[PDB]
Each structure stands twice: as C-alpha cells, then as structure tokens.
Design an enzyme around this catalytic site. Sequence first.
Site, PDB file in Angstrom:
ATOM      1  N   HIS A  64     -15.156 -11.900  59.375  1.00  0.00           N
ATOM      2  CA  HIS A  64     -13.860 -12.386  58.900  1.00  0.00           C
ATOM      3  C   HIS A  64     -14.006 -13.612  57.991  1.00  0.00           C
ATOM      4  O   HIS A  64     -13.218 -13.800  57.070  1.00  0.00           O
ATOM      5  CB  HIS A  64     -12.910 -12.687  60.074  1.00  0.00           C
ATOM      6  CG  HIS A  64     -12.742 -11.554  61.040  1.00  0.00           C
ATOM      7  ND1 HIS A  64     -12.105 -10.361  60.698  1.00  0.00           N
ATOM      8  CD2 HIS A  64     -13.118 -11.427  62.323  1.00  0.00           C
ATOM      9  CE1 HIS A  64     -12.124  -9.537  61.732  1.00  0.00           C
ATOM     10  NE2 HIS A  64     -12.722 -10.191  62.759  1.00  0.00           N
ATOM     11  N   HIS A  89     -14.726 -23.068  59.171  1.00  0.00           N
ATOM     12  CA  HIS A  89     -14.802 -21.806  58.452  1.00  0.00           C
ATOM     13  C   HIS A  89     -13.923 -21.928  57.210  1.00  0.00           C
ATOM     14  O   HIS A  89     -13.264 -22.954  57.033  1.00  0.00           O
ATOM     15  CB  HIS A  89     -14.388 -20.621  59.351  1.00  0.00           C
ATOM     16  CG  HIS A  89     -12.951 -20.677  59.742  1.00  0.00           C
ATOM     17  ND1 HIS A  89     -12.522 -21.318  60.905  1.00  0.00           N
ATOM     18  CD2 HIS A  89     -11.831 -20.240  59.101  1.00  0.00           C
ATOM     19  CE1 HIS A  89     -11.197 -21.192  61.000  1.00  0.00           C
ATOM     20  NE2 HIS A  89     -10.747 -20.570  59.885  1.00  0.00           N
ATOM     21  N   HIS A  91     -11.439 -19.850  53.881  1.00  0.00           N
ATOM     22  CA  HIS A  91     -10.594 -18.759  53.425  1.00  0.00           C
ATOM     23  C   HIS A  91     -10.593 -18.819  51.901  1.00  0.00           C
ATOM     24  O   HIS A  91     -10.413 -19.897  51.334  1.00  0.00           O
ATOM     25  CB  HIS A  91      -9.177 -18.904  54.006  1.00  0.00           C
ATOM     26  CG  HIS A  91      -9.112 -18.933  55.494  1.00  0.00           C
ATOM     27  ND1 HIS A  91      -8.970 -17.775  56.251  1.00  0.00           N
ATOM     28  CD2 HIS A  91      -9.169 -19.951  56.385  1.00  0.00           C
ATOM     29  CE1 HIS A  91      -8.953 -18.080  57.542  1.00  0.00           C
ATOM     30  NE2 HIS A  91      -9.077 -19.400  57.660  1.00  0.00           N
ATOM     31  N   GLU A 102      -4.882 -20.573  52.271  1.00  0.00           N
ATOM     32  CA  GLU A 102      -3.851 -20.054  53.160  1.00  0.00           C
ATOM     33  C   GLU A 102      -2.532 -20.781  52.911  1.00  0.00           C
ATOM     34  O   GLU A 102      -1.508 -20.151  52.687  1.00  0.00           O
ATOM     35  CB  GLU A 102      -4.327 -20.164  54.603  1.00  0.00           C
ATOM     36  CG  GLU A 102      -5.581 -19.341  54.846  1.00  0.00           C
ATOM     37  CD  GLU A 102      -5.623 -18.709  56.228  1.00  0.00           C
ATOM     38  OE1 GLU A 102      -5.756 -19.473  57.219  1.00  0.00           O
ATOM     39  OE2 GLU A 102      -5.468 -17.474  56.322  1.00  0.00           O
ATOM     40  N   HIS A 115     -11.200 -24.993  57.202  1.00  0.00           N
ATOM     41  CA  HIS A 115     -10.538 -25.275  58.461  1.00  0.00           C
ATOM     42  C   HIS A 115     -11.582 -25.795  59.447  1.00  0.00           C
ATOM     43  O   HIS A 115     -12.592 -25.130  59.682  1.00  0.00           O
ATOM     44  CB  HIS A 115      -9.888 -23.983  59.008  1.00  0.00           C
ATOM     45  CG  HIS A 115      -8.660 -23.565  58.268  1.00  0.00           C
ATOM     46  ND1 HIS A 115      -8.133 -22.266  58.322  1.00  0.00           N
ATOM     47  CD2 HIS A 115      -7.854 -24.261  57.446  1.00  0.00           C
ATOM     48  CE1 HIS A 115      -7.043 -22.204  57.565  1.00  0.00           C
ATOM     49  NE2 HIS A 115      -6.857 -23.413  57.019  1.00  0.00           N
ATOM     50  N   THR A 196      -4.092 -18.694  62.114  1.00  0.00           N
ATOM     51  CA  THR A 196      -3.825 -17.815  60.989  1.00  0.00           C
ATOM     52  C   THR A 196      -4.554 -16.476  61.110  1.00  0.00           C
ATOM     53  O   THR A 196      -4.424 -15.664  60.199  1.00  0.00           O
ATOM     54  CB  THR A 196      -4.135 -18.470  59.641  1.00  0.00           C
ATOM     55  OG1 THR A 196      -5.546 -18.634  59.498  1.00  0.00           O
ATOM     56  CG2 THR A 196      -3.431 -19.794  59.475  1.00  0.00           C
TER      57      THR A 196
HETATM   58  N1  LIG Z   1      -7.721 -19.907  60.519  1.00  0.00           N
HETATM   59  S1  LIG Z   1      -7.443 -20.952  61.899  1.00  0.00           S
HETATM   60  O1  LIG Z   1      -5.922 -20.862  62.173  1.00  0.00           O
HETATM   61  O2  LIG Z   1      -7.992 -22.306  61.493  1.00  0.00           O
HETATM   62  C1  LIG Z   1      -8.502 -20.481  63.256  1.00  0.00           C
HETATM   63  C2  LIG Z   1      -9.434 -19.487  62.965  1.00  0.00           C
HETATM   64  C3  LIG Z   1     -10.318 -19.112  63.965  1.00  0.00           C
HETATM   65  C4  LIG Z   1     -11.305 -18.056  63.563  1.00  0.00           C
HETATM   66  O3  LIG Z   1     -12.436 -18.431  63.225  1.00  0.00           O
HETATM   67  N2  LIG Z   1     -10.940 -16.742  63.540  1.00  0.00           N
HETATM   68  C5  LIG Z   1     -11.897 -15.740  63.099  1.00  0.00           C
HETATM   69  C6  LIG Z   1     -12.044 -15.860  61.578  1.00  0.00           C
HETATM   70  O4  LIG Z   1     -13.116 -16.710  61.193  1.00  0.00           O
HETATM   71  C7  LIG Z   1     -10.216 -19.756  65.229  1.00  0.00           C
HETATM   72  S2  LIG Z   1     -11.262 -19.375  66.647  1.00  0.00           S
HETATM   73  O5  LIG Z   1     -11.736 -20.677  67.263  1.00  0.00           O
HETATM   74  O6  LIG Z   1     -12.509 -18.625  66.164  1.00  0.00           O
HETATM   75  C8  LIG Z   1     -10.505 -18.410  67.906  1.00  0.00           C
HETATM   76  C9  LIG Z   1     -10.406 -17.047  67.664  1.00  0.00           C
HETATM   77  C10 LIG Z   1      -9.787 -16.239  68.638  1.00  0.00           C
HETATM   78  C11 LIG Z   1      -9.300 -16.821  69.806  1.00  0.00           C
HETATM   79  C12 LIG Z   1      -9.403 -18.188  69.997  1.00  0.00           C
HETATM   80  C13 LIG Z   1     -10.017 -19.022  69.054  1.00  0.00           C
HETATM   81  C14 LIG Z   1      -9.273 -20.729  65.493  1.00  0.00           C
HETATM   82  C15 LIG Z   1      -8.395 -21.106  64.489  1.00  0.00           C
HETATM   83 CL1  LIG Z   1      -7.189 -22.345  64.825  1.00  0.00          CL
HETATM   84 ZN   LIG Z   2      -8.811 -20.642  59.200  1.00  0.00          ZN
END
Ligand SMILES: NS(=O)(=O)c1cc(C(=O)NCCO)c(S(=O)(=O)c2ccccc2)cc1Cl
Ligand SMILES: [Zn+2]
Lengths: 261, 261
Positions: A64, A89, A91, A102, A115, A196
């Site tokens: 992703h 990470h 976007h 985003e 992010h 997101t």
């Molecule tokens: N885009 S974001 O809103 O900053 C955001 C993106 C990701 C993220 O990496 N998702 C997978 C894509 O890289 C994550 S996470 O820590 O991997 C996570 C995923 C599933 C369940 C719990 C936690 C958290 C946030 Cl807050």
């Molecule tokens: Zn993100």
Amino acid sequence: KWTYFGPDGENSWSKKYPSCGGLLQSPIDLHSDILQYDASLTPLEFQGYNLSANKQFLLTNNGHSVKLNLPSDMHIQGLQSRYSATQLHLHWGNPNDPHGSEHTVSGQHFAAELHIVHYNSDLYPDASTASNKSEGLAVLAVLIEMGSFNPSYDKIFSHLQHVKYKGQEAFVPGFNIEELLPERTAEYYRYRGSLTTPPCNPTVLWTVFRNPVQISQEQLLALETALYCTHMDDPSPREMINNFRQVQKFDERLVYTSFSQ
Amino acid sequence: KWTYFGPDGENSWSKKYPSCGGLLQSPIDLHSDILQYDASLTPLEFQGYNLSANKQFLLTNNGHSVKLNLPSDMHIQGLQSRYSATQLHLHWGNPNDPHGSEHTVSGQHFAAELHIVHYNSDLYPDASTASNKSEGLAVLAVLIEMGSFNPSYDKIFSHLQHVKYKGQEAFVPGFNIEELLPERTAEYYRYRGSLTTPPCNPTVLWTVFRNPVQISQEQLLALETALYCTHMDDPSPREMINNFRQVQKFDERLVYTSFSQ
Ligand SMILES: NS(=O)(=O)c1cc(C(=O)NCCO)c(S(=O)(=O)c2ccccc2)cc1Cl
Ligand SMILES: [Zn+2]
Ligand SMILES: NS(=O)(=O)c1cc(C(=O)NCCO)c(S(=O)(=O)c2ccccc2)cc1Cl
Ligand SMILES: [Zn+2]
C-alpha cells in the site's frame, strides 16, 4: 485485501471495513472558510527523533505504501496524551498527474504527503490496539512539493530501490527524523479524523504542518515510479501509484489552525 | 436506499450497487495535467430544446434531486449518434456551503450543477437499456455560479414549493431548455465516465461546458432549502442538501477539450 483502484478500491472499502463509510473520515480539504484560529494550539515538541546512525530501521513495501518502522522512544509532547511513534509512510500520485497528497489546501493537492503515525502509549501497547479506541492515534502530516533536492528525504528515497515489491524489507540507518519536518512546525492545522486507509477508524488526531517541504523532480519521479504494490511472483503486477484517498465531505466541522493568517 | 449522508452515503453505495465501486467513475476534477486539447471536437447542436408552452413536463422530487422529464423529440446533434433527452436534474450544496457542483475545476466547486440526460436512441429503445452499454448515455453538465437572477432557471425553481417531499410531482409548461445552457457552448470538456448516482454505471459520455451560468442568491437559497429527500410522512425527515458526489480517481483517463488551455 484492499487497493486504491478497481473493484477493491476506496469506494468498496466500507463493505468489509464499516468505519470507512462512517463519520469523521479523512483526508479533507483544508479551506479558508472552515479554518478557525486556536491560540491554544502551542508548538509540539518532538522527542527522541534524533535516531542513531549506528542503528538500523526497517523499511518495508507493504503493498500500500513504503513504510519505515520507528521506535516507540520517539514521541510527541504537547497533546492531551503521550503519543509514541510506530512508523512513517507516504502517499503520492503518478508522473502523469503528480499531485497525490491526501489533504488538499483550498482545493489543491500537493505532490505527495508524509505521515508519521503515533499511538496513545499512555493507554495502549501499540497502534494496532490503539487504532479502534477514541483518540488512539496521532499523525503528523507533511505536505510535499517539487523544488530543490532534499538530502534528508533522500535518506529514505535512496533505499526505494531495495523495496521494489510487496513484502520486501531494507535497513535504513537512523537519521534525525525532524529533518523530514517542514520549516515553522509551530504553524499547523488540527482536526479530529480517521485513518485514511482501512479500517478507517475515526480515532486519529490530525496535525498537518502549514508549510510544505520540497523534494526535487527526480526525487518525486523516483517515489512515483520505484515501487510495485504486488508480490514479485504475482501474475498481474501493478505499479504502486495513486496510493492516496480522495478527499471526504467534512460538513459543519471546523479545522483549527495554530496561525491566524 | 441511498443518500449523500450517514450510513447509506456515497462511500457505502458500492455495498448495494457494484458499479459504484467500479472503474471510470464520475464526477472528476478538471485540471491541466489530465486535459488534452482535441481539435476534432466540434460544437453541439441542440434540437427540439424549445419546448412548447402548451405542453406540460413532469417535475418530480425523486428523493435524490428534483428531476424534470424531457421528451425524446429533444435531441443533440454532433455526436456519432442521435442522443435524445430523457430528463434534467440538479446537484447543489447547502445554505452554509453553497458550493455543491459535482465536477470541480482546479479543485474548486461551483455553486450547483445541471445535468441534462440523453440516451443513444439510434441504438437503444430507452435510457435503461442504454445505461448498460458504453456511451449509451450522454449528459450535458452546466456549472452554476451565484450571480444574476436567471429567469430561465426560475421556470424550474418557481415550482419547487409543489415538490417539497419525495414522490411529490408537478407539471411545468414547456420553455426553452437552451436558455439554461451557457455562453459559447462550443467550448467544453469531453470524457468517458459514469452516472454520478447509483447505479453508477460507467456508461456515460460526458460534456461539461467551460462557461458557467448564473442564478441569484435567492434562487440558490430556494433550491437548497425547498426540498426534502424523505416522504412527507417520514418519521425522520432529511433536507435535500449536498446532493453531489465527491470527485473520483481518474483510472488512467484523459479529458478532451474543444478549447486550448
Ligand atoms: N494514512 S494514515 O491515516 O496516516 C495511517 C496509515 C496506516 C498505514 O500504514 N496503513 C497501510 C498503508 O501504508 C496506519 S497503521 O499504523 O499501519 C494501522 C493499520 C491498520 C490498523 C491499525 C493501524 C495508521 C495510520 Cl493513522
Ligand atoms: Zn497515511
Ligand atoms: N447524475 S447523472 O450522472 O447525470 C444521472 C443521474 C440519474 C438520476 O436521476 N439519478 C437519481 C438522482 O439524481 C440518471 S437516471 O435517469 O435516473 C438513470 C438511472 C438508471 C439507469 C438509467 C438512467 C442518469 C444520470 Cl446519467
Ligand atoms: Zn446528475
């Protein structure tokens, strides 16, 4: 699985991840009319961001994004709770349409967006546990535009070549993560929103820095074209591009700003 | 059922309507990166658009918009096939945010948007049949900005108070639908997309005029406050506001323009 295109794309996320069709969805358009100055938004402090160059941090293509695992000794000071880092990470869009942030500002995307994900470590052991809990997470969002070469960003991007496919991992020597933040971090937007990505839980305290960083065209091109979102052995390989969520309706809610003009 | 807010809002349509989670969705943001001038795009001719004042046309609150039925002797000339009119309807915002166009330009909403729906009557017996085939429907989109009082649009708006609730209907005497189109129709954007509402079939050839029209603040207010999505006897009424879809991923499409940008 979920993706950013085709049948399993963002319009379909809600089928399996109900929060994605719920309230408080991110990202949003940050526009003049919904901004409200909040003099109580003081400068955040970034603690433990100076990572030892003697230590290795795991970079992963997760299919992703590209993600750098971060140690929980990094934390934000200044919010209601302590929030400790888990990862960062990015976007981005694509070379034909290099506007894949985003968040938007008065309707306009930036080239890309970083992010830095943190979790409420006062209450939860990790982001995964925190992620479905009220105020469980806090993200720092940095808006990225094309400009001069950025040595600090290159500390990541120089490694993209080693995480070309879903599942691959590289080591990134520690550097000062603060180098990734824009000038005047004291200026920011603040709002309550969501992840997101699935599961889109409405549990994130968003801080988006007012000022973008610049990276060079070559740098942006590299981010946009280096990675595939498929495993190497996948019979239908897919470039990892356009890995950003469309902006969400944000009705009769305010975005608070740490700056008045 | 489907709405623009709450559990049955747009991120959820795909749960009932597979095509809403599919490719080639409308609307889209019109901006320079994804535009291609096409010298081959010639002006449309609007035939039978001057409806007889002695005939009546059914205006209905369908719960999603206000729609005026149009007769199939009304048609556009200039496409590869005769496209005959079926209906027109609108999308708008709310009193607190009067920017509810569906298409956007540089990320900016116009106040409202008129759609005039046609089906390829050369190929298909009716709109429902056409709506399952590529290029089966052609929609003309007119962007609406707050401006001068528009007497032509008042020919619709003056009837709003008789179609306040879902399922309510009224007759409008024919008038010149051409008067609802802008200046210099010769200039437009052209692209392949979908119905912007369920069932979101990707079967629409879109023409969005470059030039907006104007309606007054009073007319916009009337549109944003006269109507309800719900039946009159509904235990929980819902205002018909913000009946526009967010813009959609490009999915590798270009938009073609009849003018140079
Ligand atoms: N885009 S974001 O809103 O900053 C955001 C993106 C990701 C993220 O990496 N998702 C997978 C894509 O890289 C994550 S996470 O820590 O991997 C996570 C995923 C599933 C369940 C719990 C936690 C958290 C946030 Cl807050
Ligand atoms: Zn993100
Ligand atoms: N927004 S739009 O893309 O112009 C658009 C909106 C609607 C519409 O009214 N939907 C209900 C609410 O507006 C329609 S339709 O005539 O109800 C229709 C539905 C199913 C099969 C064929 C035709 C067609 C279009 Cl192209
Ligand atoms: Zn429409």
